[PDB]
């Protein structure tokens, strides 16, 4: 089955990249990290933006990936860091501002 | 009235295990949802077990989300719902403490609710308290990252 | 640090649940799966919906989690299945239709 | 004109390794982006290396996204961009084949592009072909899930 990768708009690709990249940062397991990295690379392929926009998305991702989240159940809540990240106002403004539409 | 402290404490112990084990113990829709991974916070399910086991069962038509066990009794699965359920069924609280510490509850026993900030999955916790320790102290992960704002005790006789 | 969990609207919680649940399905590693499950349970806590809506979200998630994705690089693209899933029209209509607002 | 087949094939081999290893070999911004995980598809980077190594370097101001190596030469990192780059620099293709099979390219050698459906990370692939096999055949995972629609060959002398 071919994935939906070619159907995403430029802004949607960048948001998809942001999410998969963040997941690649937060998870320890090599198979999961490599999968998230491979997935992010698919969204980069179809982008029309220079590499520095992804470097800047990473700068914002690191503000979330380095957080310590706690709860009344046992977990680091790594997945949650990336879900909070993809709602970040700075991230969404960065994407909307972009020079390369 | 209210569950006896002794019966409540005994019943809590039966489910003072991992959420997976709680699912096995209770079975039915509780078990199915735990096996499926939908429920991971056993807190309100253990409190539901206490109420069901001590002769104060959660009514089918209580205005809170709940699922049945193999016993055909009902189990509330949200912390916020369990807190609200107790507020509406337990009568007047016996102690309400702003910015509570464990020492504030010494010498009295029953059902304790703590609401506060710092947890990413809940606004608070509900458990039993015997005057010295909580019934799930063994799971109580943490001066922790949770900052208690309000603590409420309903004494059990 | 407390996460942003309490700031999400009911629809946003359900979409957050959908994403974390799907990630819990697709990844093999126990630490990652448990983390995604714990994260999903946080969004369920704050929902006002009955459990069957999450069961139905799962039914849709399984249409994506069972896909086989391929590429010119080595990967199962598991992360991608969940990113495609969260754009699914049926999922978004299910959430918008919901009886419990 | 065009890179000699022999020099292109030799140069390709130097980078016919894992993307991590390609990053180590090329270094500079290529390496930094590979270490950071931003690039995972080595396909266009290997083709860039071939062009840079055989005396047909990618111009700094070519209208395609690229990053520099430790050699201060430039490396295109998108498959679609590498395909378009070749279309605009290589002259007329020597063979264009609808619904191509490997057998259609027997007996001729050079740079091959295949576009098709079935891959989730790209619309196609660009590599070298020696009349019998691709230069990265050893990495060519798969009648696979990729269905070739169009194959194009520029002969290298």
UniProtKB/TrEMBL annotation, chains A, C:
Disulfide bonds join 22-82. It comes from the Bacteria. The chain holds residues 27 to 127 of 127 of the full protein. This is Periplasmic protein. It comes from Salmonella typhimurium (strain LT2 / SGSC1412 / ATCC 700720).
UniProtKB/TrEMBL annotation, chains B, D:
This is Cytoplasmic protein. It comes from the Bacteria. Disulfide bonds join 134-138.
């Amino acid at each position: 089955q071919e994935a939906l990768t070619t159907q995403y708009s430029q802004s949607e690709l960048l948001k998809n990249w942001a999410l998969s990249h963040c997941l690649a940062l937060v998870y320890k397991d090599d198979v999961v990290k490599n999968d998230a990295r491979a997935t992010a690379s698919a969204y980069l392929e179809y982008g029309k933006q220079s590499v520095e926009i992804y470097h800047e998305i990473d700068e914002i991702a690191k503000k979330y990936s380095g957080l310590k989240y706690n709860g009344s159940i046992s977990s680091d809540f790594n997945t949650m860091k990336c879900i909070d990240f993809i709602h970040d106002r700075e991230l969404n403004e960065l994407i909307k501002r972009r020079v390369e539409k | 009235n209210r569950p006896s402290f002794n019966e409540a404490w005994l019943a809590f112990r039966k489910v003072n295990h991992s959420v997976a084990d709680v699912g096995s113990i209770i079975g039915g829709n509780v078990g199915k949802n735990i096996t499926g991974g939908y429920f991971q916070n056993a807190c309100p399910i253990r409190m539901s077990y206490v109420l069901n086991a001590t002769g104060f069962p959660i009514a089918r038509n209580s205005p809170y989300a709940k699922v049945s066990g193999a016993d055909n009794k009902f189990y509330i699965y949200r912390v916020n719902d369990m807190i609200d359920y107790l507020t509406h069924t337990m009568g007047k609280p016996d102690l309400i403490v702003n910015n509570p510490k464990q020492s504030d509850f010494i010498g009295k026993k029953g059902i304790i609710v703590v609401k506060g900030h710092g947890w990413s999955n809940a606004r608070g916790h509900v458990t039993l308290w015997n005057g010295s320790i909580c019934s799930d102290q063994c799971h109580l992960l943490n001066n922790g990252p949770f900052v208690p704002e309000v603590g409420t005790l309903w004494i059990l006789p």
